[PDB]
Design a protein around this ligand. Sequence first.
Ligand SMILES: Cc1cnc(Nc2ccc(C(=O)NC3CCN(C)CC3)c(F)c2)nc1Nc1ccc(Cl)c(NS(=O)(=O)C(C)(C)C)c1
Length: 289
Amino acid sequence: QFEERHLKFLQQLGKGNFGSVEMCRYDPLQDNTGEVVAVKKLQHSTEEHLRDFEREIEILKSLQHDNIVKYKGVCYSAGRRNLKLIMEYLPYGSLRDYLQKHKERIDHIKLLQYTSQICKGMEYLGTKRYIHRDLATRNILVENENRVKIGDFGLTKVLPQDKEYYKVKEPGESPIFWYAPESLTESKFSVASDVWSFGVVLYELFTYIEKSKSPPAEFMRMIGNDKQGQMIVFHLIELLKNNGRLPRPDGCPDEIYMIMTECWNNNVNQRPSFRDLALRVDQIRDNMA
Ligand SMILES: Cc1cnc(Nc2ccc(C(=O)NC3CCN(C)CC3)c(F)c2)nc1Nc1ccc(Cl)c(NS(=O)(=O)C(C)(C)C)c1
């Protein structure tokens, strides 16, 4: 729906999983009145990545929610190659960088507001039988100080109609320190593994992205920084089987860490739902104010 002749490159916002996002200005009138948008593109346009990317586009187009980044259109250019996804531009960047920059300004009640918005977005995804699979503060964008959005769906898969999990193995590195144990061992992804990842995201938020306190740093410290290669994965698996967990962040109340640890249940069926998580976070937020 967008003509590439009118997409004016402004800068690069980030490089992702085989793809990159650029801040551009759509200005078809050539009068500097067009709107600034985000453009996602592939870096190596293989056919597998092209099919994955169009399924991602279809997924994002099917989503309308206050906490999901808005789809705007696509841009074909030549033939059907060089496909580009057009989305709304959110001016405050990733929740990771934003929280790091304003840590002296963001108290726990604001963190819980962000947490509730994330829970509601993830529940909306679940109603569509979508498994995000990549939930992390780097993937959460900030529209303003009062609104965050889930902002990337490059790893999102649709559940089969007859099964409540999706088994996917991927040639390439994976954010294993956000993954549920069943995802590490059997490549099984579900709403419950998304709940595990959400627990990791809550941990992130309450560490205020202190880099020493990052999940990879803490996990490598727990398993020993001497480990390398596939052994790392192996040790992580073992550490999760022995109920080794990320520590309570500094200043985090015990109820928030309890939410985290309940999300970190080894038994997939004993993990809370996103609606229960939203209810508990909203009740704690109401009690604090
Ligand atoms: C759709 C969208 C709408 N608005 C914005 N706003 C925005 C606005 C600003 C800065 C910015 O300033 N970035 C610099 C350089 C990179 N950071 C590491 C530090 C600061 C900025 F990154 C984003 N992003 C969007 N997407 C997006 C852009 C970059 C990245 Cl890294 C990501 N992360 S990700 O994991 O989900 C993906 C790369 C796999 C897609 C998402």
